[PDB]
Amino acid sequence: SHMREESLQLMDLLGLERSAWGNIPLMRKAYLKKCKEFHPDKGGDEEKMKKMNTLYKKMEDGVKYAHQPDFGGFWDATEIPTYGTDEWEQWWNAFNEENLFCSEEMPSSDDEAT
Amino acid sequence: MNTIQQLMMILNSASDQPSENLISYFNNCTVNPKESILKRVKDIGYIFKEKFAKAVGAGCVAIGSQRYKLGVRLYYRVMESMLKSEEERLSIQNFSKLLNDNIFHMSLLACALEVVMATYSRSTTDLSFPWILNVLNLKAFDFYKVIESFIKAEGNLTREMIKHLERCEHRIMESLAWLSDSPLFDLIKQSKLVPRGSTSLSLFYKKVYRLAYLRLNTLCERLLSEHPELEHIIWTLFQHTLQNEYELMRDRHLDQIMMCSMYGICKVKNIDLKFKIIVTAYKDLPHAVQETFKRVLIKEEEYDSIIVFYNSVFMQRLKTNILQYA
Numbered sequence: 371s372h373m374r375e376e377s378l379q380l381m382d383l384l385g386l387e388r389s390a391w392g393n394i395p396l397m398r399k400a401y402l403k404k405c406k407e408f409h410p411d412k413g414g415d416e417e418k419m420k421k422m423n424t425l426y427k428k429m430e431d432g433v434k435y436a437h438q439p440d441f442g443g444f445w446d447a448t449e450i451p452t453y454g455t456d457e458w459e460q461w462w463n464a465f466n467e468e469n470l471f472c473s474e475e476m477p478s479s480d481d482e483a484t
Numbered sequence: 485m486n487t488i489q490q491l492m493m494i495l496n497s498a499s500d501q502p503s504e505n506l507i508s509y510f511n512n513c514t515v516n517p518k519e520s521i522l523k524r525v526k527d528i529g530y531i532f533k534e535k536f537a538k539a540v541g542a543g544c545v546a547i548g549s550q551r552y553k554l555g556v557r558l559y560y561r562v563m564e565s566m567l568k569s570e571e572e573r574l575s576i577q578n579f580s581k582l583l584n585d586n587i588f589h590m591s592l593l594a595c596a597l598e599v600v601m602a603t604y605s606r607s608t609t610d611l612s613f614p615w616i617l618n619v620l621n622l623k624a625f626d627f628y629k630v631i632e633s634f635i636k637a638e639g640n641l642t643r644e645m646i647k648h649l650e651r652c653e654h655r656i657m658e659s660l661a662w663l664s665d666s667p668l669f670d671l672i673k674q675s676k677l678v679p680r681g682s683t684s685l686s687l688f689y690k691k692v693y694r695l696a697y698l699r700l701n702t703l704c705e706r707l708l709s710e711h712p713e714l715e716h717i718i719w720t721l722f723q724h725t726l727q728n729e730y731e732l733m734r735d736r737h738l739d740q741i742m743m744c745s746m747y748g749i750c751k752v753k754n755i756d757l758k759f760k761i762i763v764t765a766y767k768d769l770p771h772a773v774q775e776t777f778k779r780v781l782i783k784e785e786e787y788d789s790i791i792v793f794y795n796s797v798f799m800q801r802l803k804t805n806i807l808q809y810a
Contacts, residue, residue: 406810466807470751470799474759476778476789 380425383418394433398447401426405465410458423453488603491640495600498557506564513580521589525556528593528620535619540609551604555597558638563592565637591630594620595649599641602648613652614660624660625668628653629684657692662733672730689726696722696738699769703746707757707765714749717809721745721802729802735781736793739772743790744798752810759791 381388386400404422408415415422427450434445448469453461502510502522510518533548540548571577582588598616617627631653635646661668668688675681697719704715722745725732733741743762750757763777780793788796799806 402810406807466810467799467803469810470748470803470806472747472751472759472791472794472799474791476763476791477760 376425376428380422380429383422384426392429394430395447397426397429398450401450405462408458408462416458419458420453423450426450427452486640486642488642488645491603491642491645494561494640495554495557498561500553500557502560503564506560506567509564509567509579510583512578513583514578515580515584517580517583520584524586524589525559525593528552528590532597532619536611539611551601552597554604555593555600558596558600559593562596562634562637563589566592566633569637587626588630590620590622591627592634594622594627595630595634598652599645599649603642603645613648613655617660623666624656624663625666625671628656628661628688631656654695657688657695658738659736661688662736664735669730669734692726692738693723696726696742699739700742700746702769703742703762703765707746707761708750714753714755717753718742718745718749721749721806724805725802732798732801737776739766739769739776740780740790740793741798743777744794747794748799748802748806749809752806759794763790 377391378388381391381397384397384400384404386397390396401422404419408419410416413419430450433442434447436444448465450465451461456464507518510516510521529552532552533545536548536551537545567579567583570579594616597620598613601611601616616622617624631649635641635649641649660666671685675685700719700722701715704712704718708714722742725741725745743759743766746762747757747759766772766777767774777790779787780790782788782793782796
């Protein structure tokens with residue numbers, strides 16, 4: 371419905387050019403930049419960011435999934451959570467504290483070869 | 485050559501009483517250190533002889549006395565050399581400051597005992613390096629300060645015996661220096677509230693980087709052949725940790741930081757490096773011990789796995805410093 375209207379409406383506040391449109395990864399690379407630059411001290415985007423998020427996610431959706439009929443590249447990115455209320459720093463911190471966290475476990479142990 | 489035999493000879497035929505010439509030095513000091521250093525040797529004696537026996541079988545106190553006794557001759561022997569090779573460079577002939585400095589003697593003597601002890605060592609409940617320091621109540625760092633100068637003040641050290649001390653020195657830089665309650669810290673701070681203290685700590689650091697880096701290199705080449713531009717972005721994190729977040733080394737090991745620096749940097753750049761392989765590779769380095777990445781200090785006297793150290797401490801402390809690399 372209003373997809374093409376939100377189109378420019380999102381590429382806008384995202385600071386990207388409508389000629390690298392449906393490129394979600396390159397759009398994410400951007401969206402994240404707008405985060406590493408947001409400060410509820412220089413910016414009052416508390417509302418102009420709440421949208422910057424809502425829309426982008428509505429465009430990522432069309433890709434982040436693996437379809438029963440399995441075609442299309444595979445996603446595997448992370449997770450940009452709906453930014454509704456959670457204070458920006460508690461959110462922004464959370465997100466990185468994750469893209470930097472190690473979810474592995476040490477290995478079994480020694481060998482047995484000869 | 486400098487045969488283990490040649491040394492054993494010079495030691496046996498050496499005096500147990502300071503050289504007449506080595507006394508000329510005492511007598512040229514603002515404050516004569518004779519009785520001072522002399523009373524030391526004696527006091528240390530019991531302390532050693534005993535904290536030696538109470539760690540080695542029984543009935544063999546003779547060997548004890550012998551080792552220290554011999555240790556002592558080497559001790560004086562060096563000092564003189566160490567003093568002559570100081571009159572020359574830096575002309576002066578006095579030397580009060582140094583010869584009255586408890587730690588000096590305390591370190592020189594230690595090193596000898598470590599060298600004496602380690603050559604008559606084929607026999608011997610093991611006292612390899614680490615030991616001696618806890619006997620003389622000597623701090624790792626301080627012992628380290630005398631190592632370089634010591635190897636150079638005795639030409640009768642076997643090529644092996646030398647490597648033994650080089651290892652020691654190398655061990656103090658990778659962990660011992662940074663042990664809990666070690667002057668290395670309390671010293672570093674003070675250099676951030678009044679720079680230009682002396683070429684020493686900044687020198688130590690110099691030798692450290694020389695160490696760490698090369699390991700960092702060894703690993704970076706294997707586990708990171710593609711896009712090498714990272715080798716230098718890790719090192720930076722690393723240094724930064726040493727320089728600004730040094731406290732993070734308290735009761736930890738250089739290698740421990742290197743790795744975490746490896747992981748965290750490859751993680752903000754979205755890179756194929758799994759801690760799994762990092763630790764896997766780490767074993768191939770000519771010294772590493774599984775113990776280094778399996779037991780890592782965390783909170784109090786609680787140790788867990790490098791990974792835990794990472795997510796609960798590393799990642800959390802220099803988090804901000806990393807995020808500006810994404």
